[PDB]
Design a protein around this ligand. Structure first.
Ligand SMILES: Nc1ncnc2c1ncn2[C@@H]1O[C@H](COP(=O)(O)OP(=O)(O)OP(O)(O)=S)[C@@H](O)[C@H]1O
Length: 308
């Protein structure tokens, strides 16, 4: 009696026992909710299937040095921040640059910065800040730097601390309603536990170096949503990170503009239905940069063509 009906019968019997994303089809458009924090990268949001990182979920962002993971996060902050939310940053790398975070929309001033000493203590104050219901987004910098009492003193495994604090904190993170980012690094650890708690796990790798006549004006980044318990996994995205300026909205809107037929070429001269923007993205960008009106609706043309 019909696979289709037998499958969906049981397939449903499944979500009931293991949450939602317990099972999915790479096709499915669905949803049935939101709370969702913009990432400043439209490409990544549509590639996330929900328009941004879900709130109340634990998210892991791993990749090499200079990839982007931090920039994304800081952006995530800026958004969940400029939307009346309270951001908590547990720094264990002591590498964060305010002047860069500020230049992205992060109200640094009202940004909590806890500088732990023990990977154990970090997760503690990180967990409390979570239970205090006030925070909406918390971001731990370095799942690496989260070393225990020992090691920092003088056998076992760091991962135990992780499984511990993660076991306890995933739950609370839910009812609480705070999305928690975990930057992980490239040594190519507690990583295992995390990998299995993250409702969304993103892989961030720097695909190619940007150039605009001068030199290194930034970098191209490709993100692969390798784990996605909210929407369908394995989707991906790409955006432009400008050396000291964040993600390039304007540029991101172009990549979309052409991929979604709104913008056109013809001599490499990017043009939006009639009017020209200029030859070579570096100029069409400069075009969208100043003219917000056009850019605005190019966003509004693309943002409509897809989910929400
Ligand atoms: N303080 C800063 N000032 C200007 N640009 C920055 C700064 N920090 C990062 N960037 C830019 O962001 C890119 C990568 O983002 P990162 O913050 O390094 O992300 P990761 O998440 O790649 O970071 P580690 O983990 O490598 S800092 C760099 O190649 C820079 O162009």
């Amino acid at each position: 009696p019909d696979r289709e009906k037998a499958l969906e019968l049981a397939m449903a019997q499944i979500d009931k026992n293991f949450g939602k994303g317990s099972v999915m089809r790479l096709g499915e458009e669905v949803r049935q909710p939101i709370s969702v924090i913009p990432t400043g990268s439209i490409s990544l949001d549509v590639a996330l299937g929900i328009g941004g990182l879900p709130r109340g979920r634990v998210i892991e962002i791993y990749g090499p040095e200079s990839s982007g993971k931090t920039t994304v996060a800081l952006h995530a902050v800026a958004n969940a921040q400029a939307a009346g939310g309270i951001a908590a940053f547990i720094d264990a790398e002591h590498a964060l640059d305010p002047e860069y975070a500020k230049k992205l929309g992060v109200d640094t001033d009202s940004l909590l910065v806890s500088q732990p000493d023990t990977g154990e203590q970090a997760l503690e104050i990180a967990d409390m800040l979570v239970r205090s219901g006030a925070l909406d987004i918390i971001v731990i910098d370095s799942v690496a730097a989260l070393v225990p009492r020992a090691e920092i003193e003088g056998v076992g495994l760091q991962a135990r601390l992780m499984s511990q604090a993660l076991r306890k904190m995933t739950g609370a993170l839910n009812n609480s309603g705070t999305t928690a980012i975990f930057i992980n690094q490239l040594r190519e650890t507690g990583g295992k536990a995390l990998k299995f708690y993250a409702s969304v796990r993103l892989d961030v790798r720097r695909i190619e170096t940007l150039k605009d006549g001068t030199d290194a004006v930034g970098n191209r980044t490709r993100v692969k949503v390798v784990k996605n318990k909210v929407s369908p996994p394995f989707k991906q995205a790409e955006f432009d990170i400008l050396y000291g300026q964040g993600i390039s909205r304007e540029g991101s809107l172009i990549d979309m503009g052409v991929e979604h037929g709104f913008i056109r070429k013809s001599g490499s001269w990017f043009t939006y239905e009639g009017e020209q923007l200029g030859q070579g993205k570096e100029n069409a960008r400069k075009f969208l940069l100043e003219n917000t009106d056009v850019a605005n609706e190019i966003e509004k043309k693309i943002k409509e063509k897809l989910g929400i």
